[PDB]
Scaffold this active site. Structure first.
Site, PDB file in Angstrom:
ATOM      1  CB  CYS A 226      -0.904   0.046   1.235  1.00  0.00           C
ATOM      2  SG  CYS A 226      -1.964  -1.611   1.483  1.00  0.00           S
TER       3      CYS A 226
ATOM      4  CG  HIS B 180      -6.194   1.933  -0.928  1.00  0.00           C
ATOM      5  ND1 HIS B 180      -4.963   2.613  -1.347  1.00  0.00           N
ATOM      6  CD2 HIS B 180      -5.824   1.217  -0.224  1.00  0.00           C
ATOM      7  CE1 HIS B 180      -4.113   2.124  -0.768  1.00  0.00           C
ATOM      8  NE2 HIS B 180      -4.480   0.820  -0.195  1.00  0.00           N
TER       9      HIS B 180
ATOM     10  CB  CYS C 242      -1.820   0.745   7.578  1.00  0.00           C
ATOM     11  SG  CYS C 242      -3.605   0.873   6.336  1.00  0.00           S
TER      12      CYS C 242
ATOM     13  N   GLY D 129       0.067  -3.905   3.780  1.00  0.00           N
ATOM     14  CA  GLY D 129      -0.170  -5.398   4.021  1.00  0.00           C
ATOM     15  C   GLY D 129       1.301  -5.833   4.343  1.00  0.00           C
TER      16      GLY D 129
END
Ligand SMILES: Cn1c(=O)c2c(ncn2C)n(C)c1=O
Lengths: 727, 394, 395
Positions: free
Chosen positions: B91, B350, B380, B382
Site C-alpha cells: 500500500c 484507494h 498502513c 499489507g
C-alpha cells in the site's frame, strides 16, 4: 547410480510369464503374513523391474497380484522410527529408489494392471496407483487408502504425487491425503481410486489379463500411458497458476489451521506443501519434492511419537499385551446393562451394534425405554446419512430389550452396571440380580472413581467382579478402561478384554486404585485450567491454550460436561484416600474455583449454566460474568506456559501411575491417554510426551525434566519431576 | 547533504470499480496523461535533466507488468536517459517511490526525479500477481496469513470501536471529500482523463457518495481466517466484524505523479518549490493484525525530525479501514480537525500503487491553501509494514 | 550525501541451468531465505532489528515471485517485522539498482543497515511471464519500435564489424576464465550451496558452465518482423549479421544474491568489517531499439561523478548479456583485455536477471581483495535503452 536397488534379503516376488507375454508379479513375503514395503521388497521389486526392462521384447503386459489375504499394507515402520536427523539422506534415497521402480513400471510402454485381492493400504495402494488399471475384489475386510498421515508421515511412495495428478490438489488432499481415509472397494471405485470390481479373488488375474488383451486391441497408442503422461493433460481443478484455483488456494492453509486448531501436527502441513509444490512442476520433479518432505517428517519427532503410539503401542495392545497369558475364550450370549442413562444407553448400543443381545434394565419401564431411544435416534442419523440399511437397523434395535423387572436378567452372562456413582447403591443394584444371572456371569461396573475392590464385596462371586469403564459418548469413544480389583480373576480380565475387542474398542488393564488412570489423569488437566482461571488468566486464553495444545475439547468446556459435582466429589474423596495415613493432602488451587462456581449456581451443562452459557441446550460463548468473578486479565503468562502446564500436569501424573503400578505398560498409558481422555495424538501419548518432548530446552527426557523444573519454579512444586525420570 | 523539494504533485481522478469510467483506460495511459500535463505546466523544462522515473505498483502484471515506469518514459517520448523503475511495497508503494526519489536526490547522485504510482484495479485486481505468502502452503502456514479486513475488525474489537463508531468516521470522510471538491481544493491537482480524441472520460472521483447518511451506512452488510487470527490473539473470544464497503477503502483506478529535485535542479529549470521533504521513516508491526505499522513509523519520523505531534499542522493517514484511522488517532491523540481534513480513501478510493503519491500531493495543496507549515503523511501496509513522511511548506 | 555506504557481505547461490536444472525444484523464496540464513550463520550476534529494509530486484514478479517477494523473505526467514521488504524492477540491472538504492538510502541518513540483492528463478518463472505494458498494447509497441535484445546485439556486431569468430572468441574466453576462477577457489566463500529442508545438497556450482568449450564447437551453433523494424530506424544499414547463438549469449539460469550495505557507524555497532565502499553510482541510457548501448554513457557518468578516469579503475565487470555488447563497450573505452570480466561472466555461468547485478557486484568485492587491488567498476546494459554503473573501492 541411478538404480532400482538401495544397498542378502529374501526374494518376495514370484515371476510368471505366460504364452501371451503377460508377466504376473505375485508378491509373497515369506517373513510375515503381510506384504510390507521393507528392504526385502525393495530388492525383489528391483530385480523384477530390471527383468521387465531386459525382457521388454517378449512382454506385452504386467499384472501385479498377491498371495496373502491382503494385497499390500504399509512400509517399514521399524526402520523409519530409528531414522535420526543425520540419516535423512538415507530416507530420501530409499523412497527415491522405491519410486524409481514404480516409475519405470508406470512408463513401461505396456499396460500394467493391479490385482487387488484384499487390503491395499499406504504403500500398498501406492504400488497400485503406479498401475494403469486397478481391479479390486469386493470381499469383506478389504480397505484401500493412504493412512500415512495417521502415523505422522505422508504418502512418500508416489501417493501424494499421483492422487494430485488423478484428482487435483483440492480433492486429493481433502478426500484422501489429509486424514488418511480408508475406503471399502465399492467406495474406492466410486471416488476413482479403483477402476472396476469383481465378486471373488479368483476372477482377479483372469479379468486383469483380459483387460490387457482388450486394452492392446482397442487402445494401442494409449496402452500403458497414464493420463499425466499423455500430452494435452489438464490437472483437475487446474494448476496453482490457473486463475480459478489461485483464487481459493490461499485459503487452504488457513482452513487446515482451523481444522487442527493450531495444534503442532506437521504431517498435514507437509502433505499440502508437497501437493501444491508438486503441481507446479513436472511429474518427476514433483515426486522428488515429495521425497524431501517425507524425509523431513520421518527424521522428525512427531512422526516418532505417532509411529510409537499408533503403530507399535497399538499393535502390542491388540496382540494381547495386557491380556493374561494362558486364558482361553468364553462366549457372551446375553448382555445385561443396569441403568438407562447416557452411559448405559451407549453401552447397550455398542453391544447391540456388535451383534450382542442386550437386556437394558432401569428402575422404571419408562426410563429403560428412553435409553433404547438413544439407540433409535442414533440409528435414525445412520439411516438418514445412508450408512446402514433399514434391515440391519431393525435387527440392531431388535436386540435391545428394555425392562424394569430384575427377573428379565435370566440368561445374562455379562453384566455391565452403569448406575449413579455411589457405593451402597451399586451394592444394592448388584445384590438383586447376582442370583438371577448365570453362575459364571461377568459382574462389571462402570464406576469412574470408586475403587473396584470396595464394590466387589457387594457380591458373593467377587472373582468375577471387575471394572469396565466407558467414556461418553459411548458410541464414539474408542477406549474401555478395564480395572482389576484385588479379588478379580485373570479369567474375568481376559473375558472383558475379549469383549472390548468384540465391540470394536481398545482395552487397557489397570490395577485397582482410587481414580484409576483416566479419571485421575484428566483431573490434573482440568485442575490446571481452573487454577489458571483463579490465577486471573483470561478464559479465552485458557480455552485457546487447550485447543492449540491439541486437545479435542478445551478444558473449561470439558469442565461443564463433567459437571462440578462429580468434579468436587473427587476432591473430597481423594482427600480422604490418603488423609488416613499421616499423609498431608495439599489442596489443589482449583478447588476454590469449583466451589465458587457451585456457589454461584453454575455447575455445568447439566444445570444449564457453567463457564459457558447454554441456550436451549446449545453452548453459546463464555459466561460474560466470568471475567469480573476471577479478575480475568490480571495474569498474562505466555500461551506456551499455559499449554505446557496442562500437558506436563497429565504427563507427570501418568508417570506416577506407572510408578505406583496402576499401569503395567507405557503402551497402555499412551493409547489410554489418547483414546480415553483425549490426549493429543502428536504427543504419542502422555508417556511418550516425556521422551519426545521438544522445546527451547532441547529434545528428550532430559529436556522434559528441564522444562518441568522451569514450570515448577514459576507455578508450583507439583511440576517437579519424579525420581524415576532422573539420572 | 542536498535538500529534496517537491515542485509538482498531480493525480488523475479515481474511477470506480463497477462500471468505472477508467476501466477502458490502460494504466500506462493514466501515467502518460500526467506526464503530458507536466509538460503543459513547464514546456521549457529540459527533460534531459530528469534522471529517473520511479513508480509504485502493487500488481505489476499484465497491463502493469514489464516495468511500466520505463514504458511511460518511452511511450511519452521522454529522453531514454530518464530511467524508469517499478517498485512494490504494497500500500505504501506510492509514498515509497516519493521517499526513494527524495533519498536519491539527497545522496547527490540524482538531480531531478519523477515519482508516483499507478494502479488500475478494475483491470488488474490485487492478487493477480500471485505470491509466496499466499500461494506457497509451507510459508503461508507459518506467517499466519490473514486478510486485512479481519485485522481491522480485530482492531475495532480490541480498541472498543463500535459499528456506529466506524460508520461515523466513514460519514465524516464523505462529507470532507465532498466539501473539498465543492470548495475547489482539487481543481489544479486532479487532471481529468481524456481519450485519443480529446473527449472527456472522467473528471471527478466516481467512488464518492456525497449523499451518505448514518442510516444508510447501517443498512450495509460486513476459509478459517477468523480462527487463525484468534489463535495468535488468544485473549479475544470473538471478533466484532464492523467493517463494510461503506467504512472501508474503495477499489478504484488512478495514478499520481510527483516531481522532486534539489534546490539547484529546480532553480536551473525555472521551477518554484512548493514543499520540502523533511524526513522519512519506515517501521513495522504484527503482520497478522496487518494494520498497526503506521504508529511506530509516525513516531520514528517525528523523532528523526526532532518534532512532536504539536508541531504538525495536518495529519494524512490513508483510509484503508475506519478502525485503523481511529486507532491511529487514539494512540497519538491526533486532534479531530487535523486528521484527513479533505476526506480519504473511504470516499475517494484507494488505488494501491498510486495512493501514497495522491494523499501526498493532497497535503501539499492543503498546506498551501491553509498557509500552514507542516504535514505528516503515513500509510498502513499489507504484511505489517508502515511508511511515514513529513513535508514543510515553502 | 554525507554518510558513506559500505559493503559488509556479498554472497550468492550457484546458478542452476534452465533445462533439467538442479534449482528447478527450489522456490525463488527459498533461494533468498537460504542466503539470509547464511548471513545469520556468519554473524550470529547481529541485532537484526537494525536492518531497516530489504530491497530485492526481480524482473518477473509473478507467481512464485509475486506479492513483494522481499517482504515474503523477511517474514518467512523470521526477520524482525520492522525490516520492511520491497521489490523493484529495472530489467537487467535490478540487482545493482537494488544495491545502489540501498546505498543511496544510507547516504541520505534515514536508513542504517539495508539488505540488497535480487532473485530470479527463470526455470519456474520464464522471462515475460509478467506480460508487459508494451507487449499487450499494440498502440505503444507500434510507436516505441520495440525490438528484442538479441537483434540489437546482432545490429551492434554488424555496425562495429564483429565477426562470428570475434563474438565466439569472447565466449570461449568467458568459459575459460570462469573455469579458472572456480578451480582457483575464488568463489569458495561467496557461492553458498543450496540445500533442502533436510540439509541435503541440491547445487554447489554454476552448472551452466561448459569449461571444455572449443572454438570449433561454438562455430557449429545456429543463430538465435523484428529484423525489418530495426532497419526501419537504422536505415543506413542494409543487412543484419546474426552472429549470436546460445554459446556467446547469456545463459538462462536460476539464482539469487544478497548484499549487506550500511553506514560506518552501523557496521561498527554490530561488529562488522567493511569490505568495500560505494564510491559512486550513475544511471544513463541510449537508443531503445539497439537496446544494448546503454552502459557506455552510464560508465562515463559514474567516472566523471567519482572524479576518475578509465586508468584509475583496476577491474571492469560488465554483464555478458551478448558478446558484441562487451566488445563494443571494450572498443569504446579502450578497456584492457586483462581487466574485463576477469573471472568469466553470464555467457559461462548464467544471467539470473534481477539477481545478476548483485552477483557480479559481489564477484568484484572478492577479486579486489584477492588481487589486493583498489577500484572496480560494475555495469549492466538494460532493456528499454537503459544503463546502471557503480564504482567500489576496497577498504
Ligand atoms: C488480555 N491481554 C491483552 O490485552 C494483551 C495481551 N498481549 C497483548 N495485549 C494487548 N495478552 C497476552 C492478554 O492476555
Amino acid at each position: 547410480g541411478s538404480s532400482h536397488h538401495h544397498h542378502m534379503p529374501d526374494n518376495t516376488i514370484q515371476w510368471d510369464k505366460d504364452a501371451d507375454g503377460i508377466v504376473t508379479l505375485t508378491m509373497d513375503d515369506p517373513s510375515g503374513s503381510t506384504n510390507v514395503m521393507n528392504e526385502a521388497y525393495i530388492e525383489s521389486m528391483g530385480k523384477a523391474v530390471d527383468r521387465l526392462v531386459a525382457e521388454k521384447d517378449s512382454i506385452t503386459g504386467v499384472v501385479v497380484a498377491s498371495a496373502k489375504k491382503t494385497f499390500f499394507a504399509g512400509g517399514d515402520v521399524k526402520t523409519m522410527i530409528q531414522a535420526r536427523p543425520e540419516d535423512a539422506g538415507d530416507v530420501f534415497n530409499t523412497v527415491e529408489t522405491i519410486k524409481r521402480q514404480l516409475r519405470t513400471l508406470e512408463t513401461l510402454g505396456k499396460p500394467v494392471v493391479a490385482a487387488i485381492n484384499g487390503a491395499a493400504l499406504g504403500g500398498g495402494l501406492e504400488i497400485a496407483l503406479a498401475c494403469h488399471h486397478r481391479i479390486a475384489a469386493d470381499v469383506k475386510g478389504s480397505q484401500l487408502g493412504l493412512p500415512e498421515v495417521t502415523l505422522g508421515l505422508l504418502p512418500g511412495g508416489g501417493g501424494v504425487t499421483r492422487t494430485v495428478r488423478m484428482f487435483g490438489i483440492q480433492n486429493a488432499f481433502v478426500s484422501v491425503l489429509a486424514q488418511g481415509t480408508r475406503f471399502k472397494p465399492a467406495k474406492a471405485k466410486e471416488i476413482g481410486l479403483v477402476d472396476e470390481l469383481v465378486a471373488t479373488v479368483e476372477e482377479l488375474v483372469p479379468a486383469a489379463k483380459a483387460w490387457i488383451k482388450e486394452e492392446l486391441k482397442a487402445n494401442p497408442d494409449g496402452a500403458g500411458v497414464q493420463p499425466w503422461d499423455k500430452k494435452g493433460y489438464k490437472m483437475p481443478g487446474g494448476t496453482p497458476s490457473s486463475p480459478g484455483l489461485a483464487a481459493i488456494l490461499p485459503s487452504f492453509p488457513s482452513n487446515l489451521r482451523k481444522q487442527l486448531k493450531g495444534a503442532p501436527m506437521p504431517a498435514p502441513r507437509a502433505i499440502l506443501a508437497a501437493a501444491v509444490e508438486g503441481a507446479q512442476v513436472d511429474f518427476d520433479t514433483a515426486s522428488r519434492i515429495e521425497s524431501r518432505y517425507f524425509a523431513s517428517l520421518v527424521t522428525g519427532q512427531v512422526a516418532k511419537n505417532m509411529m510409537q503410539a499408533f503403530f507399535f503401542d497399538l499393535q502390542a495392545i491388540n496382540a494381547g499385551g495386557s491380556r493374561p497369558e494362558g486364558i482361553g475364550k468364553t462366549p457372551i450370549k446375553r448382555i445385561g446393562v443396569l441403568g438407562a442413562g447416557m452411559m448405559g444407553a451407549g453401552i447397550a448400543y455398542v453391544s447391540a451394534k456388535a451383534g450382542y443381545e442386550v437386556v437394558l434394565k432401569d428402575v422404571s419401564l419408562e426410563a429403560a425405554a428412553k435409553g433404547k431411544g438413544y439407540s433409535e435416534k442414533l440409528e435414525a442419523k445412520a439411516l438418514e446419512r445412508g450408512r446402514t440399511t433399514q434391515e440391519r437397523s431393525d435387527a440392531l434395535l431388535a436386540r435391545i430389550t428394555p425392562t424394569a423387572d430384575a427377573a428379565d436378567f435370566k440368561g445374562v452372562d455379562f453384566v455391565i452396571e452403569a448406575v449413579f456413582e455411589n457405593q451402597e447403591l451399586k451394592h444394592k443394584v448388584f445384590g438383586e440380580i447376582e442370583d438371577i444371572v448365570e453362575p459364571n456371569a461377568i459382574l462389571g461396573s462402570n464406576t469412574s472413581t470408586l475403587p473396584i475392590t470396595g464394590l466387589a464385596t457387594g457380591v458373593k462371586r467377587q472373582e468375577d467382579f471387575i471394572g469396565i469403564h466407558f467414556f461418553s459418548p459411548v458410541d464414539k469413544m474408542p477406549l474401555v478402561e478395564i480395572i482389576k480389583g484385588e479379588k478379580t480373576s485373570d479369567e474375568a480380565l481376559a473375558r472383558v478384554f475379549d469383549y472390548t475387542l468384540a465391540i470394536g474398542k481398545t482395552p487397557i488393564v489397570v490395577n485397582d486404585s482410587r481414580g484409576f488412570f483416566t479419571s485421575r489423569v484428566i483431573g490434573t488437566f482440568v485442575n490446571e485450567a481452573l487454577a489458571m482461571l483463579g490465577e486471573g488468566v483470561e478464559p479465552a486464553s485458557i480455552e485457546q491454550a487447550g485447543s492449540q495444545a491439541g486437545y479435542p475439547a478445551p478444558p473449561l468446556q470439558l469442565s461443564d460436561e463433567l459437571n462440578l459435582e462429580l468434579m468436587h466429589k473427587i476432591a473430597v474423596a481423594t482427600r480422604k484416600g490418603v488423609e488416613d495415613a499421616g499423609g498431608t493432602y495439599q489442596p489443589h488451587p482449583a478447588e476454590a474455583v469449583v466451589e465458587k462456581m457451585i456457589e454461584l449456581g453454575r455447575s455445568g451443562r447439566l444445570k444449564g449454566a457453567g463457564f459457558y452459557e447454554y441456550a436451549d441446550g446449545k453452548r453459546s460463548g463464555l459466561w460474560p460474568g466470568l471475567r469480573e468473578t476471577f479478575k480475568s486479565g490480571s495474569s498474562q503468562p505466555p500461551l506456551q506456559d499455559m499449554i505446557d502446564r496442562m500437558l506436563f500436569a497429565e504427563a507427570l501424573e501418568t508417570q506416577k501411575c506407572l510408578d505406583e503400578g496402576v499401569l503395567t505398560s507405557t503402551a497402555d498409558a499412551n493409547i489410554g491417554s489418547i483414546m480415553g481422555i483425549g490426549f493429543p495424538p502428536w504427543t504419542g501419548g502422555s508417556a511418550q510426551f516425556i521422551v519426545g518432548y521438544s522445546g527451547p530446552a532441547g529434545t528428550g527426557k532430559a529436556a522434559f525434566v528441564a522444562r518441568a523444573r522451569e514450570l515448577a519454579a514459576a507455578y508450583g512444586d507439583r511440576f517437579l519431576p519424579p525420581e524415576s525420570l532422573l539420572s | 547533504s542536498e535538500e529534496a523539494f517537491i515542485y509538482e504533485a498531480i493525480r488523475t481522478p479515481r474511477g470506480k470499480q463497477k462500471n468505472g469510467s477508467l476501466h477502458e483506460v490502460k494504466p500506462l495511459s493514466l501515467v502518460v496523461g500526467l506526464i503530458d500535463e507536466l509538460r503543459k505546466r513547464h514546456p521549457d523544462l529540459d527533460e534531459n535533466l530528469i534522471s529517473d522515473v520511479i513508480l509504485g505498483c502493487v500488481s505489476p502484471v499484465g497491463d502493469q507488468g514489464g516495468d511500466i515506469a520505463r514504458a511511460a518514459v518511452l511511450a511519452s517520448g521522454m529522453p531514454v536517459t530518464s530511467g524508469g523503475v517499478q517498485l512494490n511495497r504494497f500500500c505504501a508503494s506510492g509514498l515509497e517511490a516519493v521517499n526513494t526519489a527524495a533519498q536519491k536526490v539527497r545522496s547527490g547522485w540524482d538531480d531531478l526525479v519523477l515519482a508516483g504510482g499507478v494502479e488500475s484495479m478494475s483491470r488488474v485486481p490485487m492478487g493477480s500477481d500471485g505470491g509466496a505468502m499466499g500461494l506457497d502452503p509451507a510459508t503461508n502456514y507459518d506467517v499466519m496469513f490473514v486478510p486485512q479486513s479481519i485485522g481491522a475488525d480485530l482492531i475495532a474489537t480490541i480498541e472498543g470501536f463500535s459499528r456506529e463508531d466506524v460508520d461515523a468516521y466513514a460519514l465524516r470522510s464523505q462529507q470532507k471529500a465532498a466539501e473539498a471538491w465543492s470548495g475547489g481544493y482539487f481543481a489544479k491537482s486532479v487532471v481529468p482523463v481524456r481519450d485519443q480524441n480529446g473527449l472527456l472520460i472522467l473528471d471527478h472521483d466516481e467512488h464518492m457518495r456525497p449523499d451518505t447518511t448514518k442510516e444508510g451506512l447501517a443498512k450495509l452488510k460486513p476459509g478459517g481466517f477468523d480462527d487463525v487470527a484468534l489463535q495468535k490473539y488468544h485473549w479475544v473470544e470473538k471478533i466484532n466484524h464492523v467493517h463494510t464497503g461503506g467504512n472501508s477503502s474503495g477499489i478504484v483506478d488512478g495514478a499520481a505523479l510527483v516531481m522532486i529535485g534539489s534546490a539547484a535542479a529546480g532553480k536551473l529549470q525555472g521551477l518554484t518549490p512548493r514543499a520540502r521533504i523533511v524526513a522519512t521513516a519506515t517501521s513495522g508491526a504484527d503482520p497478522v493484525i496487518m494494520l498497526t505499522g503506521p504508529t511506530p513509523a509516525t513516531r520514528k519520523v517525528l523523532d528523526r525530525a526532532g518534532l512532536t505531534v504539536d508541531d504538525i499542522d495536518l495529519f494524512e493517514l490513508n483510509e484503508a479501514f475506519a478502525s485503523v484511522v481511529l486507532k491511529f488517532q487514539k494512540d497519538l491523540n491526533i486532534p479531530d480537525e487535523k486528521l484527513n481534513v479533505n476526506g480519504g480513501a473511504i470516499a475517494m478510493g484507494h488505488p494501491l500503487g498510486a495512493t501514497g503519491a495522491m494523499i501526498l500531493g493532497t497535503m501539499v495543496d492543503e498546506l498551501e491553501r491553509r498557509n500552514a507549515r507542516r504535514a505528516l503523511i503515513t500509510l498502513c501496509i499489507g504484511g505489517g509494514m508502515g511508511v511515514a513522511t513529513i513535508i514543510e511548506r515553502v
